Amino acid sequence: MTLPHIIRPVEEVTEEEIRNICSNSREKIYNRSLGSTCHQCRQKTTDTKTNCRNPDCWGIRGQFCGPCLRNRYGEEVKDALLDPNWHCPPCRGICNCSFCRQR
Amino acid sequence: MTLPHIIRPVEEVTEEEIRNICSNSREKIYNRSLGSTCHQCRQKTTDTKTNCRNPDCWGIRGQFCGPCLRNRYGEEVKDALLDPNWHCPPCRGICNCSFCRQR
DNA sequence: TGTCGCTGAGAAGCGTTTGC
DNA sequence: TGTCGCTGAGAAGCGTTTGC
Ligand SMILES: [Mg+2]
Ligand SMILES: [Zn+2]
Ligand SMILES: [Zn+2]
Ligand SMILES: [Zn+2]
Ligand SMILES: [Zn+2]
Ligand SMILES: [Zn+2]
Ligand SMILES: [Zn+2]
């Protein structure tokens, strides 16, 4: 059931993907088929989300929506998508989601 | 992929299952279809194996073969199968398998 | 510009495997 | 009477969800 984690190279990141980053939480488009889930807000939407570059990372915990990364971690998805060494907050051990800050 | 954990009641344990407990490791029958895996020796065989009674337990880590439970933990599968309150060594946190004693 | 609860999740088994 | 290495594993998303 675990969705495979695939590292998208920074040179392979499209400007269409960059412009499809969500800016306002309430303006999201839910899609049970093509959408992706943000680890923080746990909403499966079509807006572009971050991609963890840690080889040992797995699953969906590296995917964060636009609003979530800039409000819970003070970082921009556009910078994380083009960051060669970006690790998700779970990898950094700084995730403050409902689950992570309890466990 | 996780095999569901089902608690077999002690009153529902068959004498045929009891007599099918493995006694010698080298006299095991491998079966990729009907066999079960022992958490300790990691062999999928048809010999009767233990069943953890912990409700929060999951997966295969509660299944131990005859030789493994009596050689690594000094306990008998026949006693564990009829024990109302038996928890597997992983639940007791005393598992000494190759993986558990490292992590 | 905004978030958590809840279910169900939380591997398993072949291969290179058997104590001195 | 006997055991470990190795791959691949290690959730995800709807519902009861949006900061004052
Ligand atoms: Mg799974
Ligand atoms: Zn989010
Ligand atoms: Zn990560
Ligand atoms: Zn988290
Ligand atoms: Zn065994
Ligand atoms: Zn158990
Ligand atoms: Zn173990």
Is residue B97 helix, strand or coil?
A: coil
Q: How far is the CA of A52 from the centre of ligand 3 (A)?
A: 5
- The range of the structural domain enclosing residue A64 comes to 10-92
CA A61/CA A87 separation, integer angstroms:
11
Q: Encoding tokens for residue A57?
A: 């990372």
Q: Is residue A86 part of a domain?
A: yes
Q: Is the CB of B44 under 7 A from strand D?
A: no
Cα distances from B39 to residues A27, A52, A69, B36, in angstroms, run 49, 33, 40, 10
Q: How far is the CA of A63 from the centre of ligand 2 (A)?
A: 8
| Burial of A67 from C-beta contacts in 10 A (0-12 / 13-18 / 19+) | buried
Q: Is residue A2 part of a domain?
A: no
CATH number of the domain that residue B34 is part of: 3.30.40
Q: Is residue A4 part of a domain?
A: no
Q: Is residue B102 part of a domain?
A: no
CA A54/CA A71 separation, integer angstroms:
22
Q: Look at chain B and report how many structural domains it folds into.
A: 1
Contacts of B52 (CB under 8 A, 6+ apart): B5, B7, B61, B62, B63, B86, B87, B88, B91
Could you tell me the distance in Å between the CA of residue B3 and the C1' of nucleotide C9?
12
CA B6/CA B59 separation, integer angstroms:
9
Q: Is residue A22 part of a domain?
A: yes
CA B46/CA B28 separation, integer angstroms:
7
Cα distances from A22 to residues A38, A49, A80, in angstroms, run 11, 8, 14
Q: Is residue A55 part of a domain?
A: yes
What DSSP line would sit under A50-77, residue for residue? Answer: -----TT--TTTT---HHHHHHHSS--H
Q: Is residue A5 part of a domain?
A: no
Q: Encoding tokens for residue B102?
A: 């490292």
- List of A residues 18-57 with CB within 7 A of strand D: 25-26, 28, 30, 32, 35-37, 41-44, 56
Handedness of CA A60, B42, B29, B59 (dihedral sign): negative
Backbone torsions φ then ψ of B21, nearest 5 degrees: -70, 135
Residue with tokens 């992570």: A100
Q: Is residue A43 part of a domain?
A: yes
Per the DSSP assignment, residues forming a β-bridge with A36 are A45
